Amino acid sequence: RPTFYRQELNKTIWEVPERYQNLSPVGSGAYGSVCAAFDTKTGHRVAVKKLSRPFQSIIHAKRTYRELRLLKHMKHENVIGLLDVFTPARSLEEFNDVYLVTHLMGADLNNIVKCQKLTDDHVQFLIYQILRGLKYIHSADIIHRDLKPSNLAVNEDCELKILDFGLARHTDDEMTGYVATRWYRAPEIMLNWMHYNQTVDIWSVGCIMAELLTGRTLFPGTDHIDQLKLILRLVGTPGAELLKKISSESARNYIQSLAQMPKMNFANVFIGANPLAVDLLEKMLVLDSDKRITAAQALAHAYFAQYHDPDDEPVADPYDQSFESRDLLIDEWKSLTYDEVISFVPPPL
């Protein structure tokens, strides 16, 4: 066991291995806060996330386990992975706190679009890296579900990594960042139209891409109906098939209540854009989930011709999500989480 040391940080206590030095807050992450640190063992800059009351509810505890299992599985350049996971506890019996460690990233795309204009070349490379991570995540049968600029970590040299993937599970659940999440949400999940799938994430990438190009939120809805008004204003109203694919007879009656809006031609919307970028957008922001381009197809699109490499766009190993169907107490989620902390093997140095 390493020697730990203690320190207070944004009015919470941090107990970490002595290798991690110079802790400095850089904000909040999914159910916790994050400090930058320097790891005197490897010479790397790291981000250390302390989970917030990880076992103070069943929802929290199960989310803790989910998150630790995901982060242990993800091994990809464009997805946040784990350098270290630790706890100051010497046994299950005193286990209360969980800390996760990854490579320090310099900013997120939300703060990026907020302080500079991006050129088409930046947009190309940023979007490429998102679709590349997403092809990986999706190959493991994981859906991000909450893709948004603040969940995309970037460095000064335009390197990007996805984070907070696979942590959402219900639109009935309370979570932070709800209003921003909605701006990028595919309409079928937002409004529970049908059983959804992983194409929800491509709608989100289309929204983000439109935003990186223009510097403005594409669909800044104030609530569910307003959000829907804004979407249909661009993509038009749902044609023939799609209404036949809305089980949600409540949404369906509401929708056909709405007077027809036509589909705009994106070339006429996004003035000054690379026609390739416009044509990718056309393929991502289709109302019919069945008709959206997949991550893997999108990488082959000519917009990314300069970065695309079919032999360096890998898929993921099998990932067991069978725990998701289980109904357990806080202490059983705790013990599972402890197991995963103990069995952690750090990646190749």
């Binding site: 310099g106 900013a107 703060n111 990026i112 907020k114 302080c115 500079q116 204009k117 991006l118 050129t119 088409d120 070349d121 930046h122 490379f125 970037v154 460095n155 000064e156 040299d157 335009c158 439109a210 190009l213 223009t214 510097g215 403005r216 594409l218 006429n268 919307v269 996004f270 003035i271 000054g272 854009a273 690379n274 970028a277």
Partner: peptide
């Protein structure tokens, strides 16, 4: 409505971002 791009595309190589403080 039109939403012009921040930087109109021009027909023609290393990328950087200014980091927030």
């Amino acid at each position: 409505r039109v939403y012009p791009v921040s930087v109109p595309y021009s027909s023609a190589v290393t990328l950087s971002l200014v980091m927030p403080s």
